[PDB]
Amino acid sequence: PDAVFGDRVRRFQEFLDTFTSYRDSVRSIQVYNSNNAANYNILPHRIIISLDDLREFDR
Amino acid sequence: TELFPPNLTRRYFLYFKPLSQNCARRYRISSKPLSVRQIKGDFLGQLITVRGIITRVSDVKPA
Numbered sequence: 636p637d638a639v640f641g642d643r644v645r646r647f648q649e650f651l652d653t654f655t656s657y658r659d660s661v662r663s664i665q666v667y668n669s670n671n672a673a674n675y676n677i678l679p680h681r682i683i684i685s686l687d688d689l690r691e692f693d694r
Numbered sequence: 695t696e697l698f699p700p701n702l703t704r705r706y707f708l709y710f711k712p713l714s715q716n717c718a719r720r721y722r723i724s725s726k727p728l729s730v731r732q733i734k735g736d737f738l739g740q741l742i743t744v745r746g747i748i749t750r751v752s753d754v755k756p757a
Contacts, residue, residue, distance in 0.1 A: 676722045 653688040712741065 654661070661682055668677055712725035727745050728737075 676719065 649693060650689070653684070653693075656688070657682065657684075710741065712743065 651658075664678055671677070714725045714727075718725075724741065725743055727743055730744055730746065733742065733744070
């Protein structure tokens with residue numbers, strides 16, 4: 636692939652700032668689900684990407 | 695010459711039985727009486743008990 640993969644990789648460095656505010660969110664939702672499952676004696680994998688973090692600076 | 699497949703001479707079966715007593719509160723779940731409603735997930739290929747009301751009883755046929 637180099638043409639069909641290049642703007643993937645250039646995005647692969649681009650959108651990592653578009654989850655500066657979600658890279659906390661995506662791990663905080665599982666660390667207790669990993670915790671409570673080890674001490675029982677639950678949420679799906681939802682990563683809401685807003686428009687705002689992908690329209691202010693990528694066209 | 696053909697040996698017996700192991701299914702020929704059994705004349706017996708197997709069974710299983712889980713637990714929901716204070717041994718679950720001793721130290722550690724797989725036998726909470728879940729309903730039918732929440733069951734479609736990773737609970738496919740496991741051992742789960744479910745309560746209910748039995749309807750549509752067929753007969754006994756030789757398999």
